[PDB]
Design a protein around this nucleic acid. Structure first.
Ligand SMILES: CCN1C[C@H](C)n2c(c(O)c3c(=O)n(Cc4ccc(F)c(Cl)c4)nc(C(=O)NC)c32)C1=O
Ligand SMILES: CCN1C[C@H](C)n2c(c(O)c3c(=O)n(Cc4ccc(F)c(Cl)c4)nc(C(=O)NC)c32)C1=O
Ligand SMILES: [Mg+2]
Ligand SMILES: [Mg+2]
Ligand SMILES: [Mg+2]
Ligand SMILES: [Mg+2]
Ligand SMILES: [Zn+2]
Ligand SMILES: [Zn+2]
Lengths: 269, 213, 269, 214, 210, 210, 210, 212
DNA sequence: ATTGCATAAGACAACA
DNA sequence: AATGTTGTCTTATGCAAT
DNA sequence: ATTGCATAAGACAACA
DNA sequence: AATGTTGTCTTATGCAAT
């Protein structure tokens, strides 16, 4: 008897379990009477497409700025990370002036080389006329994320947090609770550099530096199963890289490389 | 590489006030590093190789002159802390400082080239000094000098591009772990592995896989 | 060779994995050299004891106010929940004044009975002198949570969110997008009351109203394994109530009733 | 049985201006009294009353009342049919459709004044204390005793007991046989504690090893 | 910069070109707002050459509301006057070369001539261009000067002439009234229903309605 | 039959109209998706006439990618073939009269002839057009078929110049005629071809159409 | 009040219970409410000295004593007693609001206890010579170590009178300079390192130091 | 044997000090755990003087759950037992001069005698003191006894009035040193304090081990 | 054995 | 002073049918 | 088998 | 315009030894 069930949901908007228990009704009718109400199901599907990444070294770079209280009066720091190799370059400045980014990138070029693209937020001086003109003169791409979410640059942001942690560790292990003397600024910065780039982090068996200078890229990945957008796993692609977080896959015919979350891919057979 | 380094402090008038220029050069790769200095100090002494170590690594020995800031106890204690072997020399000797000759020459050449190239003749703008230094650094390190068949970077890092995972032994059905295999991708509980000869990729559980040697 | 490892950590603050890999050392020495540094571990233990609850019906009650735009010009609602049986009573008022608070409780009292304790946030009118003296005249307790965390009354707040959801569903399922006519307010409130109290919510097989009027309470719990704060699981207590969220366990000799995180208990033998 | 027949009428209360019209709903099997008040005798106000009375007490099976203008009006009629309750009318004052309504009315009319003199209100309580007075009167009439029995209307209505045991479930034994005579106590994750109905012996058992009984 | 929209005010004039000889005459219709152009071809000045001009002009870029002209004799001719009477668009006179009537058409003639010379030297014709190449050369000049933006502007001269979702805001609510235009891998652009404007929002910040 | 997008597919044919003597050899070219009709008059079939109409047609519609034509000694001639190569446009020549591709161009030719007729006898030129009137009458008929109407469409051609899935209803059947514009993790956003209405349908209630 | 053992208020009162030695000697501490009463049936320098010191004996060494201008309170013997005691003496009417009134209220409560205890034992106004000290001392016990009022700590606990942690604040930072006094099962009261002020905080918003 | 608890058991006895004359008699009460002593120095010995001493003693210090005194006619009076019933405190009696609970009382009485004598000789009275300064001598002696520490003992009689388990910690050396009682214990580490230095440090939960 | 199902286990969000 | 909660949703799993 | 260990797998946070 | 990331930590598991 689902007529009283329909009336009960319409006049009361009752959950399926109670509807089943209150009118001697079972699984099915409970479901297809509870989904009829549009008001009972509005939100519960929010898509999550989460995938920035580059493939090879000196392809995609990220950049943000940091306010470091210990670095007074030169608190502002510009941090740059190579997405492929996770190497880090930072420099110290006093203003957010475009000239600082001019210098910071120039040093970053000298240490790592010339990348192809640089992703960054729409900072007050990142999109400045002089900055864009000089960047074009150097001849490298520039792509700003969505204007307002400091989350598309998650790699440089996490590297920022990590660098702040490391520099504070060194400073307050050197006996400086509040701030660093102007003398020790460069020594702290360079020691942090050598600590981070030249020593592997976490559990990966690869140092960031020899990751950068000795990159490994697969020319032909292994077959995998792919949660193609239609909703179900499909067979017949190969994963290029499968990071701890997220992965890149390649077609067998179209040879497309796309960045998808690791949940969308599982190994073949 | 990363065995012996040299250094010197050289003047130049165009970057006033911080006209003091520090140099450090490797032997096996002839890589260069340069830092500005308002004035030569035993502390600024510290500031240089710390930067130099980060970009290149930790060498095995360093040779220099008997400079005032080169010989105070601060530098000695710091190099001892890092465990690096100092070896002083004559301020101008050739049996010691030998690559720094070519270094200084090329550095001054490139600095003049860029300083006149960007429309300046006697004084770089104070905001534009580090730009020129970094540009000279990149040009002299990532580009071959003269006849050099390789840039300093190629010699220093051997920047090859491998494409195969490390040698890894996989638990075979007899229980043993046969070597000669290389992992390709570390998935979830499964790692695709190839044979170095048959070139066949196989998914194997993460519990049956362990590295070689 | 752990001397260079000690130096490397002291001057450089390296993770145990890299220290082990960089000085030909293993598990132990890497550990007890990385924990020597006080700066390598500061936060990573933040206690979380999360347990407000009552035992029997009409023992502990909670209360909060709600601003509901659809209920204009009488938007303010007073919500009361019995923590034991999760019954809800809501009354409508125009101001948060003490007199409104006076009105709300006795209406709830007439429906559920007389409780003993009424937890609430330190509202401007809950602690008012008239409210306090009138409550003492009725003669039941009054306990305020910490002054500032609207999180210790989490039950009334969650029921608040649920009630707002239900009233929204009823309102816009009847053809009132933005607000409600004065002629519809009372019957909307009554229908919302009837829906939640007299029907199942989620998967529990016991109606809140028949939980309140016909409660079941165990006089002696079954043996369990208890994470006494001593570090590990102590054997020799019995759980009284084990909610999906959190549980209460009893001593076998001290006869103590304690509200404990559910992760701290597991079945005995 | 409880919750089978209800009763309703109005009552004019001059002591309660301007909202001087009061509605009373009474159960028959338990004599539980539910009241709500409205200034004007219209439809919308009195279905608000019935909705509140249903919410506090539940859904009855039949409602008997007078032949008042709204009581048989359409709005009320289809509202009640959608609710699915059997309406009943009668002589406006007959001793059958209004057997207990007048008794509840006189009880309430005594209680309201009793309390008004209790807080020293003679002519008309201010609009602020009307709801509090009504709630206090409802609590006094419902949860207490005015008869001479050992069961309050709440004790009559909800069958209020204090259980000690959970629902019975048929546990499976290791040999694979389902076995009733067991009642669960605690639904802990993975393991549920179930007690032997005879020996009062509890035991921890995996979740899928037990199924509900009957 | 007048605030009036397109298709409102026109301007007409002819020009001379020895390159296009013997069909050495050309005319262009320009808008004060859009600055869009239509080019015809003729070898003699006639009241019907403008008629060929107007018919080509009105068809490509819609109907004009008002046209400002000069005191040419053929512009008041009986044939073109009957044409304009059939059209329904007013005709205005003036002085030949003021700043209020002849505002941009002369400079448009000069720019069109400069384009025709530069393209003629690009494809290899200096003195004059044969009548066979005129059509494609004029088409190329038109496409370069119309399909491509010239100078600086927020929109090209040709530009001058969705299922409903709920997105978050900084407040934290879920406002309604937008429609997604493009569905990116992890991003989206949504157009408001009332303020009909497009804003880019990450995929993890939007949910639909109904 | 309706195309996929403007400025990506083209087609052409040859027409002759005795009233346009001696330049009676027209060159019709129409789009498929955008259905834009353009012609250019000449007085013989030749590589010269073909490349002139085509180059003129390039800038009046848009830079071409691949145009489908018919067989003959003009499109297949060496000069026009190298013209196709130089302009980066392919060839898909078929039967001279194939039903799959030339029925639409033949219908367009009939429409063009009928419009030229109707407008010419509306003006007062019945049988054949003089030299000074040919361009004006061609422009007149084109104007009649630029921005008024096409004859049946609610979305005119030059105004325009999801895979199919089966959905579910409460009835008990899986109905087709729906293409998903937008896909969600717990629903789909499909739109019908006819009603062109977008509705959020749960992912359970859809499955591929063939 | 701020700290105990700081301000002492001694006054004399008459209770007809222990007549003919009906005079009393009582001292009140403002910041602790601790009370000492020594029976003294004659207001004299010896009696006030004996009770004053017995007041110190019961509780401890003060820093000052506030009394009135009674001739038995500023006598040379009393002045020398205070001088060799090294404490301060201030006169009064008495009857001020902030001070010299808590002594009267404490006398009222002390006698409240003596009357209730006497009527519990069975004496109305006159008590035996072996009962005055008993009644007064029983009243001291009842009033002192049994909480009176609406406090959580008894008056004797109101007499004389952790590891460092980092707490989060509304900003989200984690500041130092804090210590834990009481450790609840899900809550904690924290005291500042410098201000030494105690506030409570959820146990989930604190992490330790070093 | 002092791990019973403060404000639990009290010991009372009479000692006749040679300085209180002519009000020679004195009733003394002591606490086993709190080490807190209060006296009144009456001018007579009897049950009325006993309970006047007793009832001021309990007001000064706290509420014992038991008060113990040597058997005799000076404490078994019916008025004393009515007083006890009015206060509901259990009572027991022992040998008048046994070592069960009276050696501490005897040493406390001797300490009172010595402190009183030294204070009197400091003031200037060698043998006898006027009846006006007896109380001040008593108050000063009580302040010395209670507030200030007696002997090398760190815990003053105040500290044992209204007041974690011992544990051993893990040292880098190899010593599970004692002298540590956790104050606030978390799930990652603890907050221990020493017993003598009384310094608070945070040590990992793997760095600790209980005592006995 | 494969597929499908009925359930259980686990995750997410938001309440001034 | 006095501490998160839980409906809703999603995925995983074992059984039952096939 | 019981304990411990060596490992793997999973969870939290914060960065203008 | 153009999308979270991962080091650090805790818990669980299995094997190897006892
Ligand atoms: C003093 C009068 N007063 C309130 C202060 C203004 N307040 C009051 C509230 O009812 C709330 C409230 O509901 N929530 C929502 C919330 C947030 C997080 C949770 F975990 C849960 Cl359980 C609830 N927040 C606050 C608040 O201000 N800061 C979080 C709040 C209130 O009544
Ligand atoms: C306009 C110029 N501009 C910035 C706006 C002001 N901004 C900038 C930043 O660098 C940050 C930033 O780092 N974070 C920290 C953060 C917060 C959450 C995350 F998920 C991740 Cl990865 C990072 N937040 C902001 C911000 O907008 N609101 C919190 C932000 C910036 O450079
Ligand atoms: Mg930023
Ligand atoms: Mg940022
Ligand atoms: Mg609140
Ligand atoms: Mg709230
Ligand atoms: Zn619904
Ligand atoms: Zn460290």
């Amino acid at each position: 008897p689902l007529r009283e069930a329909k009336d009960l949901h319409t006049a009361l908007h009752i959950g399926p379990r109670a509807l089943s228990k209150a009118c001697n009704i079972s699984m099915q009718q409970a479901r297809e009477v509870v989904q009829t109400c549009p008001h009972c199901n509005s939100a519960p599907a929010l898509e999550a497409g989460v995938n920035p990444r580059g493939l090879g070294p000196l392809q995609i770079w990220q950049t943000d700025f940091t306010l470091e209280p210990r670095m007074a009066p030169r608190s502002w720091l510009a941090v740059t990370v190579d997405t492929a190799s996770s190497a880090i370059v930072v420099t110290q400045h006093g203003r957010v002036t475009s000239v600082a980014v001019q210098h910071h990138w120039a040093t970053a070029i000298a240490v790592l080389g010339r990348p192809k693209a640089i992703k960054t937020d729409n900072g007050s001086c990142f999109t400045s006329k002089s900055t864009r003109e000089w960047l074009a003169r150097w001849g490298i791409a520039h792509t700003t994320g969505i204007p307002g979410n400091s989350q598309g640059q998650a790699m440089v942001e996490r590297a920022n947090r990590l660098l702040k942690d490391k520099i504070r560790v060194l400073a307050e292990g050197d006996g400086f609770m509040k701030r660093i003397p102007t003398s020790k600024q460069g020594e702290l910065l360079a020691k942090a550099m050598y600590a981070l780039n030249h020593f592997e982090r976490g559990e990966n068996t690869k140092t960031p530096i020899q990751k950068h200078w000795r990159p490994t890229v697969l020319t032909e990945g292994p077959p995998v199963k792919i949660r193609i957008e239609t909703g179900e796993w499909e067979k017949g692609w190969n994963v290029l890289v499968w990071g701890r977080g997220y992965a890149a896959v390649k077609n067998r015919d179209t040879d497309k490389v796309i960045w998808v979350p690791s949940r969308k891919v599982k190994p073949d057979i | 590489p990363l065995q012996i380094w040299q250094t010197d402090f050289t003047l130049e008038p165009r970057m006033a006030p911080r006209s003091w220029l520090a140099v450090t050069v490797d032997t096996a790769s002839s890589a260069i590093v340069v830092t500005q200095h308002g004035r030569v100090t035993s502390v600024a002494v510290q500031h240089h190789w710390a930067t130099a170590i980060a970009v290149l690594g930790r060498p095995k020995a360093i040779k220099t002159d008997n400079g005032s800031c080169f010989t105070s106890k601060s530098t000695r204690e710091w190099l001892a802390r890092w465990g690096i072997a100092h070896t002083t020399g004559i301020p101008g000797n050739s049996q010691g400082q030998a690559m720094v000759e070519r270094a200084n020459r090329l550095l001054k050449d490139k600095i003049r080239v860029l300083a006149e190239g960007d429309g300046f003749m006697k004084r770089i703008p104070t905001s534009k000094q580090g730009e020129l230094l970094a540009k000279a650094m990149y040009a002299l390190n990532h580009f071959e000098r003269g006849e050099n068949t390789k840039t300093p970077i190629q010699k220093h890092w051997r920047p090859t591009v491998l494409t195969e995972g490390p040698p890894v032994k996989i638990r075979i059905e007899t229980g043993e772990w046969e070597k000669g295999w290389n992992v390709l991708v570390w998935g979830r509980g499964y790692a695709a592995v190839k044979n170095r000869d048959t070139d066949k990729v196989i998914w194997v559980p993460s519990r049956k896989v362990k590295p070689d040697i």
